[PDB]
């Protein structure tokens, strides 16, 4: 579970494990795929997707997911998590605002991202309905058995941990997690690399002038922009994405039927939608003479139909056609 710098972490820029990168309000189904720097899913070892492992300290905390909250302008709905990554059904929102509850603390993370949800169709809803026609939307999956893409996930760079740099009663005293690789020296001249167990520091004294580092590359990370490079190498760790964008047919929009009214080679149409509906036509002469107008306000319109025919498209309701001799 990677940890990075959340931008407006409740107060201001903290370093949250759930630091939000790559917000994708690019689908249609009320859904956003998000990456936390935290890797929830199974535990550290082997069990139960519905548990929760973020970083506390240098360490993980692979425990229950109890009170996740993604949210935006309104509280979102989770869809599924896998890896670093969560899918959640959100409404539109100027921002994105994520957070669980460990239990002692709220411990959330928030971010800017322009979000919208147009459904696919000539109706510009704000939200998916219960009914209407199905038609080919873009949307992310529920599932994990997924390989359609993979993002590079090589090592972490080092990280700071000044909990290490204690004092040896006059000298600044570094320690190690588990024998991990601590990269160490101070502004003064003393040990210059640091690949060690718990060292002391002969020369410097102040904690604030030393290299508290953790080369702990036993587990790779996501290659966040808010990661410091592991300077050594491009290690392996090519790793999939679960939530591929797929060609789901969203349960989708439908605009109320029109009121057809006859006139001489002319369609008066008293019209009354639910939401802004893009109407348009095609006078089937080799003179096309089409028309487009989003209609949200109910409006009686007109169409000079010709002899050979016109067609009529009340939103994603199917196209009509008309003989006006």
């Amino acid at each position: 579970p990677y940890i990075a710098d959340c931008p407006n972490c409740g107060h201001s820029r903290c370093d949250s494990p759930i630091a939000i990168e790559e917000v994708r309000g690019d689908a249609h189904a009320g859904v956003i795929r998000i990456q936390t720097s935290a890797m929830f899913g199974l535990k550290t070892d082997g069990v139960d997707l519905a548990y929760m492992s973020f970083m506390n300290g240098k360490t993980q905390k692979s425990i229950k997911i109890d009170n996740l909250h993604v949210r935006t302008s309104a509280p979102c709905s989770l869809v599924s998590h896998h890896g670093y990554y969560i899918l959640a059904q959100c409404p539109p929102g100027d921002t994105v605002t994520v957070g669980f509850h460990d239990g002692p603390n709220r411990h959330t993370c928030t971010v800017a991202h322009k979000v919208e949800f147009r459904p696919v169709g000539r109706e510009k809803y704000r939200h998916p309905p219960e009914h209407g026609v199905e038609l080919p939307c873009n949307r992310y999956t529920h599932k994990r058995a997924d390989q359609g893409h993979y993002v590079e996930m090589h090592q972490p760079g080092l990280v700071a941990d000044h909990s290490l740099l204690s004092i040896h009663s006059a000298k600044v005293k570094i320690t190690v997690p588990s024998g991990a690789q601590v990269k160490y020296y101070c502004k003064c001249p003393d040990v210059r690399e640091g690949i060690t167990s718990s060292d002391h520091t002969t020369t410097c004294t102040d904690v604030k002038q030393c290299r508290a580092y953790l080369i702990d590359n036993k587990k790779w990370v996501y290659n966040s922009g808010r990661l410091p490079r592991g300077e050594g190498d491009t290690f392996k760790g090519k790793l999939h994405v679960p939530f591929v964008p797929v060609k789901a047919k969203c349960i989708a929009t439908l605009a109320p039927e029109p009121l057809v009214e006859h006139k001489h080679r002319t369609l008066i149409l008293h019209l009354h939608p639910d939401h802004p509906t893009l109407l348009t036509t095609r006078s089937l002469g080799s003179d096309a003479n089409p028309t487009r107008q989003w209609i949200e306000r109910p409006t009686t319109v007109n169409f000079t139909v010709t002899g050979e025919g016109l067609e009529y498209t009340w939103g994603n309701h199917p196209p009509k056609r008309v003989w006006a001799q």
């Binding site: 006859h262 369609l267 089937l284 002469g285 096309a288 089409p290 056609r321």
Partner: protein, 155 residues
Amino acid sequence: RDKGAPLNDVAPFGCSIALEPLRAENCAVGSIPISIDIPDAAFTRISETPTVSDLECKITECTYASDFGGIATVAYKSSKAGNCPIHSPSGVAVIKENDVTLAESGSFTFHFSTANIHPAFKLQVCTSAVTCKGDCKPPKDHIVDYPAQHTESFT
């Protein structure tokens, strides 16, 4: 969201579209010089269909319209009895019936549609021409899909 409109909503001369082989379906424009070689076996020899001449044709309720509202009885005067393919070689009249059954010199109405108030169209009832002259009436109810008439000219 600041795009232009689609060609299946702005094209001319009547087309539909697919992200499929990139066709533009059903583009109604112009003419096509079409020519067929029928199987001669499918022909019936002339001496087996009834000769229908010494007949008479007349409209009874001609509808000056698109749907096949035009009708006309025909005083069929046959020799044998059987089928008799029909057509108006003039494009004025478009007929719903390709073929009419015949007893020994009966009468059978067909359906059609025209565009000229005085439809003076020949009717070729299996090698027997006839003018089905008359007069037609305008309809009232014009909001449904596309016509069968497609023969508008000077009238």
